[PDB]
Structure 1
Amino acid sequence: DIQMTQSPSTLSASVGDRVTITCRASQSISSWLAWYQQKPGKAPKLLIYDASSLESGVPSRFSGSGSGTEFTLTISSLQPDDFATYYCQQYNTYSWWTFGQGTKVDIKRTVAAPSVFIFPPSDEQLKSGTASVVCLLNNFYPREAKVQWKVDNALQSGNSQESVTEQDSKDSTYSLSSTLTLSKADYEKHKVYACEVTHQGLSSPVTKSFNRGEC
């Protein structure tokens, strides 16, 4: 199958900016590529097809170029209505169409490192036979942030999940919570619980941790 890789993952922008998103195909596809716009909770909307043809009634500030493997979508002067997620799609083959992973165009602000806080399980939860640890990343920009959990130095893979807020309408940041869930029994078998956070506003990854017994 053809993999479509868009970049960047989030494009920071302001009203009036000239904004360009890129989309790369893992196989050549001539001009058989379309661009979609999508807002949260709503269906996608076709902007451009055949790489450079406008769907009728779409504003002419939208343009596209490329043919082969490298394609660009340009918004010449961003409007408030244009903050959204944008997808490319290839239809080179009749047999299998694929979309890129999406590019979110959000409201540009200064870089802000997250405040990272960690919450051991409540003694309350411990009596139910499970133990959850929560790592809060508060008020950060841009959206890209990596959370890694370690228990006594062991990378945890499969027992965590993440949730992110929409861009704050006031301060334009994001916040993120990750929950690591273990059995009571193995929680009481280990000592160090560590949330490692990677974010552009940090000079290096930050680790917030606690030892099980202490508070």
Structure 2
Amino acid sequence: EIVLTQSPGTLSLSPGERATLSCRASQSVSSSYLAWYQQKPGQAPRLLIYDASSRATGIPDRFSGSGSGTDFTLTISRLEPEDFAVYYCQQYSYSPVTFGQGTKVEIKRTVAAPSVFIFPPSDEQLKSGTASVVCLLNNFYPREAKVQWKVDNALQSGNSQESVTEQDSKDSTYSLSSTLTLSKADYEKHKVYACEVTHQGLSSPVTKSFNRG
């Protein structure tokens, strides 16, 4: 089958800039049967281009496609606010139809450090036998960060889950939650609960913490 790969994985660009997205095929895509889609959360992909360079009906002029063989390009000549989304290439030259893994186009803004907060588990929850401790990283950019849990200076692994909001529509920041889940037994066997955050906007990692009380 034809394997499609897209590059880059993420484009960070300002509104109004041009975006150039690449699609490479593992072998030749005959007759340029290549399509591009835009995808937004909770929505089915929206066909932009087919036959490598033909706009679907009602698609704005600023979306244009080119390429042939094993190399294709989607150009978005001007990024409107509604254009920051995920973009996928698809070949329909040989069965099975295959899809690329997507290129995310996000809004570039100035680097913003996260505000970090830590929340102990509530009395209510412990009574259920489980304890969740939440670390919040609020309104940061770019998206990348490192978040380590330390319990009595012990680096924790395998027991925490992360989640990240979509880029904020007003200020183009991201927020992140890391939730460390353990039983009540394992909770009150320990004293120091700390969240350590490394981010480009910070001169050195910030740690927020509490002692279980």
Q: What TM-score range do you get, normalising by the shorter chain?
A: 0.7 to 0.9
Match of 1:62 in 2: 63
Moved more, 131-140 or 69-78: 69-78
Q: What percent of counterpart residues are identical?
A: 70
Amino acid at match of 1:64: G
Cα deviation for residue 123 of structure 1 reads: 3.6
Answer whether contact 1:23 1:100 (CA < 8 A) is retained: no
Moved more, 147-156 or 53-62: 147-156
Moved more, 71-80 or 186-195: 186-195
Match of 1:153 in 2: 154
Cα deviation for residue 174 of structure 1 reads: 2.0
CA distance in 2, matches of 1:3, 1:92: 12
Amino acid at match of 2:73: T
The reply on whether 1:108 has 2:111 as its aligned counterpart is no
Larger Rg: 2
Aligned residues: 209
Match of 2:127 in 1: 127
* Gap change, CA 1:201 and 1:35, over 3 Å in 2: farther
The reply on whether 1:86 has 2:87 as its aligned counterpart is yes
Q: Could you say what secondary structure the match of 1:187 adopts?
A: helix
Match of 1:187 in 2: 187
Render the CA deviation track for 1:124-168: whole Å, top value 9, x for unaligned.
Answer: 4222211111110111122334434454534422x3333333333
Match of 2:178 in 1: 178
Amino acid at match of 2:36: W
The reply on whether 1:12 has 2:7 as its aligned counterpart is no
Scaled by the length of structure 1, what TM-score is found?
0.77
* Gap change, CA 1:47 and 1:171, over 3 Å in 2: same
CA distance in 2, matches of 1:24, 1:197: 36
RMSD between aligned alpha carbons?
A: 3.0
Match of 2:35 in 1: 34
Which consecutive unaligned segments of at least 5 residues does structure 1 have? none
Scaled by the length of structure 2, what TM-score is found?
0.78
* Gap change, CA 1:192 and 1:143, over 3 Å in 2: same
Which consecutive unaligned segments of at least 5 residues does structure 2 have? none
Q: Could you say what secondary structure the match of 2:186 adopts?
A: helix
Cα deviation for residue 183 of structure 1 reads: 0.9
Match of 1:168 in 2: 168
CA distance in 1, matches of 2:101, 2:137: 27
* Gap change, CA 1:81 and 1:171, over 3 Å in 2: closer
